[PDB]
Write a protein that binds this ligand. Structure first.
Ligand SMILES: Nc1nc2c(ncn2[C@@H]2O[C@H](COP(=O)(O)OP(=O)(O)OP(=O)(O)O)[C@@H](O)[C@H]2O)c(=O)[nH]1
Ligand SMILES: N[C@@H](Cc1ccccc1)C(=O)O
Ligand SMILES: [Mg+2]
Ligand SMILES: [Mg+2]
Ligand SMILES: [Mg+2]
Ligand SMILES: [Mg+2]
Ligand SMILES: [Mg+2]
Ligand SMILES: [Mg+2]
Ligand SMILES: [Mg+2]
Ligand SMILES: [Mg+2]
Ligand SMILES: [Mg+2]
Ligand SMILES: [Mg+2]
Ligand SMILES: [Mg+2]
Ligand SMILES: [Mg+2]
Ligand SMILES: [Mg+2]
Ligand SMILES: [Mg+2]
Ligand SMILES: [Mg+2]
Ligand SMILES: [Mg+2]
Ligand SMILES: [Mg+2]
Ligand SMILES: [Mg+2]
Ligand SMILES: [Mg+2]
Ligand SMILES: [Mg+2]
Ligand SMILES: [Mg+2]
Ligand SMILES: [Mg+2]
Ligand SMILES: [Mg+2]
Ligand SMILES: [Mg+2]
Ligand SMILES: [Mg+2]
Ligand SMILES: [Mg+2]
Ligand SMILES: [Mg+2]
Ligand SMILES: [Mg+2]
Ligand SMILES: [Mg+2]
Ligand SMILES: [Mg+2]
Ligand SMILES: [Mg+2]
Ligand SMILES: [Mg+2]
Ligand SMILES: [Mg+2]
Ligand SMILES: [Mg+2]
Ligand SMILES: [Mg+2]
Ligand SMILES: [Mg+2]
Ligand SMILES: [Mg+2]
Ligand SMILES: [Mg+2]
Ligand SMILES: [Mg+2]
Ligand SMILES: [Mg+2]
Ligand SMILES: [Mg+2]
Ligand SMILES: [Mg+2]
Ligand SMILES: [Mg+2]
Ligand SMILES: [Mg+2]
Ligand SMILES: [Mg+2]
Ligand SMILES: [Mg+2]
Ligand SMILES: [Mg+2]
Ligand SMILES: [Mg+2]
Ligand SMILES: [Mg+2]
Ligand SMILES: [Mg+2]
Ligand SMILES: [Mg+2]
Ligand SMILES: [Mg+2]
Ligand SMILES: [Mg+2]
Ligand SMILES: [Mg+2]
Ligand SMILES: [Mg+2]
Ligand SMILES: [Mg+2]
Ligand SMILES: [Mg+2]
Ligand SMILES: [Mg+2]
Ligand SMILES: [Mg+2]
Ligand SMILES: [Mg+2]
Ligand SMILES: [Mg+2]
Ligand SMILES: [Mg+2]
Ligand SMILES: [Mg+2]
Ligand SMILES: [Mg+2]
Ligand SMILES: [Mg+2]
Ligand SMILES: [Mg+2]
Ligand SMILES: [Mg+2]
Ligand SMILES: [Mg+2]
Ligand SMILES: [Mg+2]
Ligand SMILES: [Mg+2]
Ligand SMILES: [Mg+2]
Ligand SMILES: [Mg+2]
Ligand SMILES: [Mg+2]
Ligand SMILES: [Mg+2]
Ligand SMILES: [Mg+2]
Ligand SMILES: [Mg+2]
Ligand SMILES: [Mg+2]
Ligand SMILES: [Mg+2]
Ligand SMILES: [Mg+2]
Ligand SMILES: [Mg+2]
Ligand SMILES: [Mg+2]
Ligand SMILES: [Mg+2]
Ligand SMILES: [Mg+2]
Ligand SMILES: [Mg+2]
Ligand SMILES: [Mg+2]
Ligand SMILES: [Mg+2]
Ligand SMILES: [Mg+2]
Ligand SMILES: [Mg+2]
Ligand SMILES: [Mg+2]
Ligand SMILES: [Mg+2]
Ligand SMILES: [Mg+2]
Ligand SMILES: [Mg+2]
Ligand SMILES: [Mg+2]
Ligand SMILES: [Mg+2]
Ligand SMILES: [Mg+2]
Ligand SMILES: [Mg+2]
Ligand SMILES: [Mg+2]
Ligand SMILES: [Mg+2]
Ligand SMILES: [Mg+2]
Ligand SMILES: [Mg+2]
Ligand SMILES: [Mg+2]
Ligand SMILES: [Mg+2]
Ligand SMILES: [Mg+2]
Ligand SMILES: [Mg+2]
Ligand SMILES: [Mg+2]
Ligand SMILES: [Mg+2]
Ligand SMILES: [Mg+2]
Ligand SMILES: [Mg+2]
Ligand SMILES: [Mg+2]
Ligand SMILES: [Mg+2]
Ligand SMILES: [Mg+2]
Ligand SMILES: [Mg+2]
Ligand SMILES: [Mg+2]
Ligand SMILES: [Mg+2]
Ligand SMILES: [Mg+2]
Ligand SMILES: [Mg+2]
Ligand SMILES: [Mg+2]
Ligand SMILES: [Mg+2]
Ligand SMILES: [Mg+2]
Ligand SMILES: [Mg+2]
Ligand SMILES: [Mg+2]
Ligand SMILES: [Mg+2]
Ligand SMILES: [Mg+2]
Ligand SMILES: [Mg+2]
Ligand SMILES: [Mg+2]
Ligand SMILES: [Mg+2]
Ligand SMILES: [Mg+2]
Ligand SMILES: [Mg+2]
Ligand SMILES: [Mg+2]
Ligand SMILES: [Mg+2]
Ligand SMILES: [Mg+2]
Ligand SMILES: [Mg+2]
Ligand SMILES: [Mg+2]
Ligand SMILES: [Mg+2]
Ligand SMILES: [Mg+2]
Ligand SMILES: [Mg+2]
Ligand SMILES: [Mg+2]
Ligand SMILES: [Mg+2]
Ligand SMILES: [Mg+2]
Ligand SMILES: [Mg+2]
Ligand SMILES: [Mg+2]
Lengths: 85, 393, 82, 60, 205
RNA sequence: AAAUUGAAGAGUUUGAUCAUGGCUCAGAUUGAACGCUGGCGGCAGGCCUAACACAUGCAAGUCGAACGGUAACAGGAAGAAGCUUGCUUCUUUGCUGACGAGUGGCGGACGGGUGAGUAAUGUCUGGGAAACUGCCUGAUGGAGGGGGAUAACUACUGGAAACGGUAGCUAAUACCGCAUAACGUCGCAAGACCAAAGAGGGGGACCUUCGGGCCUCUUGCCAUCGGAUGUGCCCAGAUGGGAUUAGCUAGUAGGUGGGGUAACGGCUCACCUAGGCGACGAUCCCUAGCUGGUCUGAGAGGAUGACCAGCCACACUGGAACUGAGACACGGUCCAGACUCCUACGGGAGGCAGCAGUGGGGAAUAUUGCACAAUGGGCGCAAGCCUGAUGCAGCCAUGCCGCGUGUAUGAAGAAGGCCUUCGGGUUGUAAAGUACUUUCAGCGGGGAGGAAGGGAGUAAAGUUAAUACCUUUGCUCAUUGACGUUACCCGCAGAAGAAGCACCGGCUAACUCCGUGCCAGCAGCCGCGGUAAUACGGAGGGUGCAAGCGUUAAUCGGAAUUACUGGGCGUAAAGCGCACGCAGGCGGUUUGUUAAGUCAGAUGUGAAAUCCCCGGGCUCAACCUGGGAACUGCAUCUGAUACUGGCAA
RNA sequence: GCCCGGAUAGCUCAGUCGGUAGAGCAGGGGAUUGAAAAUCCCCGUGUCCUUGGUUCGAUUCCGAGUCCGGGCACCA
């Protein structure tokens, strides 16, 4: 390509390697809660929720995840713990 | 079109002349590799002098190719002529712009019919100086046989009105100097010395207004249509008004970049081959034969009086009388053109070897002024030289 | 970032600037919120020249609108200067 | 299509590229165009003086 | 831009004296006026309703020295202005600078006044003006500059203006070549012969 | 005060007529083209077809006050070596200033270009929100302790190149812990949970271990809550043509529940119900960017959407996401396809519907312009550097406007041409000649206004421990123009340099004759031309128009020939063969009652430009431009309730 | 830049290997009927695409050109 600001074509390739890793980490911790939900009482689910709550809020602050995404991942997920168990 | 051409060392337009398949084009290939190795100029090769399908399957050259070899004293500009009997028309354009030729007669074959036709065209058009070069040598290992050919070349030039005995004859194989033989490399370095010594500094016309005959039109995927040729008189500055006059009619234009062998120029001076660039003109509408003049200097004419000197059998021309309605080819600066002759009153017939004036109506108009020199030709041969007397149109 | 800038209208060799409140991203002559007076550089010593409604400037600059290099000085021209 | 060649005499033959303007003749059924005299290969009419924009002729 | 042809020929075709060839002498009696427009002036014309209108339009053009493109623009301005469309056509023509300079007396003919305007001689409100179609505003002071003041062509031409009717809407000094355009010209003040009515009709269709 | 003063007909069917009715013409135009003649200025304009293919130069960079770099480069300082001992050679020095490379940050999504698609996802007005919002900004003040590593640089290799790998090594506002938390997020609440980066201009006092510890200020970095700003969505009507397209439709139409979205939603799933759209045109088809406007018109309308400005859409063709405040990204990425290039045949580059330029297709349409001086726009603490944004330099009458090829007198009514009843007429005061001016071109000299600033120094006022730096304001300096031999002015010389092309039976201003004898040709309609032509060529008077004029194409007009304003249907074209009848259109009449229609008012809005009036500004004018009206809207809120409807008796 | 083909009286075609070119359709001095279907007579009415050469003599054999046809290349 015909720009010295190509740097952004690599720089962004370098970004998403990191950006996908922290994103994948969060959604595995959310999957850990959804795994605990289904056949489990008020114990294993809320332990997994207590683990992911710091992780989801942290990634919301960095600009990876928007604060509304994080708000739903508590709101709808706490309702699964509250209603079922 | 990147590096700027520095105006140092006098420009001279050189070119090879000689018989068919006589080491004429191969001489140009030898001069490049010899001069480029020792002095340290640009290299090039024998291929770039003549490629295409026409000059490979056959081997013979048609197009007037150009080469630029440099030396301490002067900056030369080569013009390799075709050489055959069929290619005399495009040769005369290459031979007209040439100042000092390099004749090519060979030590095995010797002088041949075309060699006499080439030197004939050189005199009437304009070839002041000439240098001989034996382009085989090594094939016939003998002292007496090779030197007998040198005598007949001295006879030819002196017979056809050149210096002859005074011309510096050189010997040397072109193919031997192409590889790397120390004896034959030095013998063509001697030819470069003979070019400097014999041919003097050429006299230009950098005062009277701009004119430039077109030898070959290009359509450079570049800039637009480009026209090549030697600047006959005046100068060419970039972004200057240029009127194209000659065949068809007349068209206004402007120069947007002059060059010298793929290198930039500010001022295209007189007496040097340059590729002048024209603005807002297509490939087809501009053709070969027209001239790049300054607006108002020259006007296209289709009728003119002219003092024609007809040749006899001894000089080389017609041997029979002719009457009004005869149509020969009139070679002006570059191109030729057909035209009907109208003789004066009190002249029944024009005999060969005679001085008379006559009106000449041309089929195509060409740019001309009073005191322009031309050479009439017909039937694959010369007819009569002359000069323009009066304008009519 | 909203900004108060000159728009450049008028004929060739005869400029007439329409000082105007617009978004920075929008083009010079294009989109704007509201025009706030004008400027005429080729007016000379006579009746009219430069007019700039200072009440509307306080509504934008007081909020948060940057003033361009020229319009900043046309404020300095209209208030005090002489 | 078919195109009417105006004026007296012409240089059109076999091929020859010609410019065509609109306008019926109202006589020849089918002909609905004119050849512009002067444009391209279609030359001007010989010896016309009055009305020479039509018929594409130069000054005298 | 200008006619620059045989000027008195126009007066015969029209019939009436157009003041094109007025000049130093008062009356011509030097063209066979009325009865010789061209080769066939003896031919009595039938003269249609389109004719009389087109003749009347050409009369007012040729008097004031104006061309169809510029004259058609005066109609467009005259229509857009208040009051009578006919009276405005004439009033806008009369407000021209080459007309005012003629009516002041600084020019034997209207073409002379036009050249005198053109050639930087005329000056109004301390400003030089080259334009013949300069619309002279009410309450102005046209005058000649000190360089070309009291030259050969003007002094002889001003003596002719004493024989002329002399407008009421403008005033002239005569001593120091100084004029004063006061009010806009009234219909009843000037002409009383050239019909505006027919010109208003011609352009309407 | 003003804001509209605006409405023409004629030829043509017949022996003649009046009607009906087509056909044609006079006028406006324009992204025009060609033709003929081919002088200027000003303000404009300039690939409509191939969204065709593109070589060559360019169009987004930028920051040393974020950091390693003791630096790629060019240059001072401690010291060195030659020898003309200051002339030269030359190692160290953040150390001279800065900066090629690089990580960072912020820009590249704006600003430019083109209408391929799109008949509604889009556009216009009017609404609503269920939203996000880098940089600007108003608060609330934090801003504390750590630690891997990571390029460049080596080191070592792979590759023809493009572009890698492996061993170290190191830097940061880069990167992730960490304590830390609010009116923040979540919960019914108790609780739990969630962040940051330091720089730089200066310093008296005292620590000096000199890296200066430490105080100042300016800026950055944060946390929500509010601005302003764009952007996402959503509903109302409006926005082409076709029924020789009447049936289309299965995530289809709704529900519950889960996921996902910045945000709601069949956005997407699982199940449930059987819908939904449709004769006030669904579906399918063809064509089409849309609007402000433009052209036209008496107006209603009709046509159109080049230039300027708003919005959408697209980027070699089909996809997908990544990065971001913003893109599913014209000059990013990755595939896929077609098309040209380079090679060591292994794999590679490749995107002008930027700006110039080119080849092509064409009736046809620009300069491989100069500059950041200017307003912007990007980054920067400032200088700056970048910009084909923008201005402007050229080209072309393609136009709009204003200038000019002189202006007086001039009778022998000359010559010559043309006509003639040969008496004369006419060309024609035309010309020749006499009076003269001499705006433009051409020369020679003056010379504005586009320029605001920025920079370097000064006196004060803020700041503070401080008369230092820093911030602000006066004040002295020397400067900044691509245009540019500028706008404009003044002297010079001498009418000198400076014309047009239509047609001239009729309609339509303008006729005499030599005619090429239904030949040559003319023509927009009626028609001309067949040995006496105003209708053909030609000479020739005019007629007409002017640096243009013609021809042609195209839209309206006239055409009241799609008629709403404003036509008809006995015989001219046109009453279904005649009934019944749902949907639809219309509906007698007096008292209530509503307020949908209807009207009155008011508020909001109908972007700017355009149009118009009043003005002003350039020598006037086009042109630009200040200020009002308007934008036949729509929306609401409150009232007249006669008239229409509804709901009543 | 160079290779090839094409041209014959007004139009459509015959004729040539040097022996000096013809046909219809044409048209004209031409008669019919105010012009006329069918009539008669009558000529070719010619730069053999142009020009030169080898020649006793060239359409015809050999150069050089004209404008047009189609083919292959060169990037200052
Ligand atoms: N033995 C020998 N042969 C040579 C020499 N130089 C050239 N040649 C030969 O000559 C030929 C070159 O002929 P040129 O006349 O140069 O080529 P050309 O100019 O294209 O030929 P034309 O265009 O036909 O004149 C080649 O085939 C060579 O083999 C030499 O020195 N010795
Ligand atoms: N002056 C030219 C001569 C040239 C002409 C044509 C081809 C090549 C060279 C150089 O280059
Ligand atoms: Mg995975
Ligand atoms: Mg996983
Ligand atoms: Mg934690
Ligand atoms: Mg992100
Ligand atoms: Mg001034
Ligand atoms: Mg700036
Ligand atoms: Mg027509
Ligand atoms: Mg005619
Ligand atoms: Mg004009
Ligand atoms: Mg009208
Ligand atoms: Mg009023
Ligand atoms: Mg009107
Ligand atoms: Mg009749
Ligand atoms: Mg009848
Ligand atoms: Mg033209
Ligand atoms: Mg033309
Ligand atoms: Mg010209
Ligand atoms: Mg312009
Ligand atoms: Mg296009
Ligand atoms: Mg199209
Ligand atoms: Mg297209
Ligand atoms: Mg393309
Ligand atoms: Mg380059
Ligand atoms: Mg490039
Ligand atoms: Mg530093
Ligand atoms: Mg750097
Ligand atoms: Mg981009
Ligand atoms: Mg976009
Ligand atoms: Mg744009
Ligand atoms: Mg854009
Ligand atoms: Mg363009
Ligand atoms: Mg467009
Ligand atoms: Mg558009
Ligand atoms: Mg919608
Ligand atoms: Mg959308
Ligand atoms: Mg609202
Ligand atoms: Mg918010
Ligand atoms: Mg940011
Ligand atoms: Mg960002
Ligand atoms: Mg933020
Ligand atoms: Mg702040
Ligand atoms: Mg407070
Ligand atoms: Mg407080
Ligand atoms: Mg604060
Ligand atoms: Mg660390
Ligand atoms: Mg470490
Ligand atoms: Mg490593
Ligand atoms: Mg390591
Ligand atoms: Mg360190
Ligand atoms: Mg650190
Ligand atoms: Mg960080
Ligand atoms: Mg903790
Ligand atoms: Mg705590
Ligand atoms: Mg709550
Ligand atoms: Mg930290
Ligand atoms: Mg600090
Ligand atoms: Mg510091
Ligand atoms: Mg401290
Ligand atoms: Mg908003
Ligand atoms: Mg489903
Ligand atoms: Mg997002
Ligand atoms: Mg109408
Ligand atoms: Mg439309
Ligand atoms: Mg366009
Ligand atoms: Mg433009
Ligand atoms: Mg635009
Ligand atoms: Mg939108
Ligand atoms: Mg694509
Ligand atoms: Mg796509
Ligand atoms: Mg898609
Ligand atoms: Mg993101
Ligand atoms: Mg988004
Ligand atoms: Mg897009
Ligand atoms: Mg997508
Ligand atoms: Mg691009
Ligand atoms: Mg692909
Ligand atoms: Mg490239
Ligand atoms: Mg490129
Ligand atoms: Mg382009
Ligand atoms: Mg082109
Ligand atoms: Mg073409
Ligand atoms: Mg250039
Ligand atoms: Mg430049
Ligand atoms: Mg530049
Ligand atoms: Mg610069
Ligand atoms: Mg500069
Ligand atoms: Mg700037
Ligand atoms: Mg600063
Ligand atoms: Mg650059
Ligand atoms: Mg010109
Ligand atoms: Mg106008
Ligand atoms: Mg004379
Ligand atoms: Mg000059
Ligand atoms: Mg002034
Ligand atoms: Mg200035
Ligand atoms: Mg200043
Ligand atoms: Mg000033
Ligand atoms: Mg300062
Ligand atoms: Mg100081
Ligand atoms: Mg300069
Ligand atoms: Mg300059
Ligand atoms: Mg000057
Ligand atoms: Mg000006
Ligand atoms: Mg004189
Ligand atoms: Mg004279
Ligand atoms: Mg006949
Ligand atoms: Mg027409
Ligand atoms: Mg006679
Ligand atoms: Mg006629
Ligand atoms: Mg006639
Ligand atoms: Mg005449
Ligand atoms: Mg026209
Ligand atoms: Mg109508
Ligand atoms: Mg009717
Ligand atoms: Mg009937
Ligand atoms: Mg009937
Ligand atoms: Mg019927
Ligand atoms: Mg009936
Ligand atoms: Mg019913
Ligand atoms: Mg009803
Ligand atoms: Mg009723
Ligand atoms: Mg009803
Ligand atoms: Mg109501
Ligand atoms: Mg109302
Ligand atoms: Mg209102
Ligand atoms: Mg508006
Ligand atoms: Mg306005
Ligand atoms: Mg007024
Ligand atoms: Mg005004
Ligand atoms: Mg004014
Ligand atoms: Mg003024
Ligand atoms: Mg206007
Ligand atoms: Mg306004
Ligand atoms: Mg208003
Ligand atoms: Mg009112
Ligand atoms: Mg209103
Ligand atoms: Mg309006
Ligand atoms: Mg009420
Ligand atoms: Mg009631
Ligand atoms: Mg009442
Ligand atoms: Mg009621």
């Amino acid at each position: 390509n015909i720009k010295s600001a190509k740097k952004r074509a690599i720089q962004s390739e370098k970004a998403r390697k990191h950006n996908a890793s922290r994103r994948s980490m969060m959604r595995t911790f959310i999957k850990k809660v959804y795994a605990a939900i289904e056949a489990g009482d008020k114990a294993a689910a809320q332990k997994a929720f207590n683990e992911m709550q710091p992780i989801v809020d942290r990634q919301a602050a960095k600009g990876l995840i928007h604060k509304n995404k994080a708000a739903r991942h508590k709101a709808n997920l706490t309702a699964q713990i509250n209603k079922l168990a | 079109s990147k590096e700027k051409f520095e105006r140092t060392k006098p420009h001279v337009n050189v070119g090879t002349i000689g018989h068919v398949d006589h080491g004429k084009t191969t001489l140009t290939a030898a001069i490049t590799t010899v001069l480029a190795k020792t002095y340290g100029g640009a290299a090039r090769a024998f291929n770039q002098i003549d490629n295409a399908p026409e000059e490979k399957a056959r081997g013979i050259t048609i197009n007037t190719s150009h080469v630029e070899y440099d030396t301490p004293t002067r900056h030369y500009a080569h013009v390799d002529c075709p050489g055959a009997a069929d290619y005399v028309k495009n040769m005369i354009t290459g031979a007209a712009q040439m100042d000092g030729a390099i004749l090519v007669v060979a030590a095995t074959d010797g002088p041949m019919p075309q060699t006499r036709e080439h030197i004939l065209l050189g005199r009437q058009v304009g070839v002041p100086y000439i240098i001989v070069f034996l382009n085989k040598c090594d094939m016939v290992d003998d002292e007496e046989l090779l030197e007998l050919v040198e005598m007949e070349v001295r006879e030819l030039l002196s017979q056809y009105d050149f210096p002859g005995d005074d011309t510096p004859i050189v010997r040397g194989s072109a193919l031997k100097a192409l590889e790397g033989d120390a004896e034959w490399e030095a013998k063509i370095l001697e030819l470069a010395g003979f070019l400097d010594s014999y041919i003097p500094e050429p006299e230009r016309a950098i005062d009277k207004p701009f004119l430039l005959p077109i030898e070959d039109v290009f359509s450079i995927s570049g800039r637009g249509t480009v026209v090549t040729g030697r600047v006959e008189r005046g100068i060419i500055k970039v972004g200057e008004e240029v009127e194209i006059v000659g065949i068809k009619e007349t068209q206004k234009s402007t120069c947007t970049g002059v060059e010298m062998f793929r290198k930039l120029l500010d001022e295209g001076r007189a007496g040097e081959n340059v590729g002048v660039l024209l603005r807002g003109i297509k490939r087809e509408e501009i053709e070969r034969g027209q001239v790049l003049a300054k607006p108002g200097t020259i006007k296209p004419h289709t009728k003119f009086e002219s003092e024609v000197y007809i040749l006899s059998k001894d000089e080389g021309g017609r041997h029979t009388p002719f009457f009004k309605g005869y149509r020969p080819q009139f070679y002006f600066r570059t191109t030729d053109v057909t035209g009907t002759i109208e003789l004066p009153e009190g002249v029944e017939m024009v005999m060969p070897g005679d001085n008379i004036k006559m009106v000449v109506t041309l089929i195509h108009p060409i740019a001309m002024d009073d005191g322009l020199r031309f050479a009439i030709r017909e039937g694959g041969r010369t007819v009569g030289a002359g000069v323009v007397a009066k304008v009519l149109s | 970032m909203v900004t108060i800038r000159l728009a450049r209208h008028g004929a060739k060799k005869r400029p007439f600037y329409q000082v105007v409140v617009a978004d920075s991203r929008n083009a010079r002559n294009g989109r704007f919120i509201e025009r706030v007076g004008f400027f005429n550089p080729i007016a000379s010593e006579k009746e009219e020249g430069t007019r700039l409604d200072l009440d509307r400037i306080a509504h934008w600059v007081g909020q948060g609108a940057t003033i361009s290099d020229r319009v900043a000085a046309l404020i300095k021209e209209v208030n005090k200067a002489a | 299509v078919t195109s009417y060649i105006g004026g007296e005499g012409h240089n059109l033959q076999e091929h020859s590229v010609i410019l065509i303007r609109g306008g019926r003749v109202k006589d020849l059924p089918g002909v609905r165009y004119h050849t512009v005299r002067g444009a391209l290969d279609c030359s001007g009419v010989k010896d016309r003086k009055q009305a020479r924009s039509k018929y594409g002729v130069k000054r005298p | 831009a200008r006619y620059l042809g045989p000027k008195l020929k126009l007066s015969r075709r029209e019939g009436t004296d157009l003041f094109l060839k007025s000049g130093v002498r008062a009356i011509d009696t030097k063209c066979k006026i009325e009865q010789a427009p061209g080769q066939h002036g003896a031919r009595k014309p039938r003269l249609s309703d389109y004719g009389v209108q087109l003749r009347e339009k050409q009369k007012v053009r040729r008097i004031y020295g104006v061309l169809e493109r510029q004259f058609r623009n005066y109609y467009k301005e005259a229509a857009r202005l208040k009051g009578n469309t006919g009276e405005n056509l004439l009033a806008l023509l009369e407000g021209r600078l080459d007309n005012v300079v003629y009516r002041m007396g600084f020019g034997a003919t209207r073409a002379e006044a036009r050249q005198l305007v053109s050639h930087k001689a005329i000056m109004v409100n301390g400003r030089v003006v080259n334009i013949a179609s300069y619309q002279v505003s009410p309450n102005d002071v046209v005058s000649i500059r000190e360089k070309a003041k009291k030259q050969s062509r003007v002094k002889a031409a001003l003596e002719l203006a004493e024989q002329r009717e002399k407008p009421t809407w403008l005033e002239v000094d005569a001593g120091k070549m100084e004029g004063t355009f006061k009010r806009k010209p009234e219909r009843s003040d000037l002409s009383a012969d050239i019909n505006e009515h027919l010109i208003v009709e011609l352009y309407s269709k």
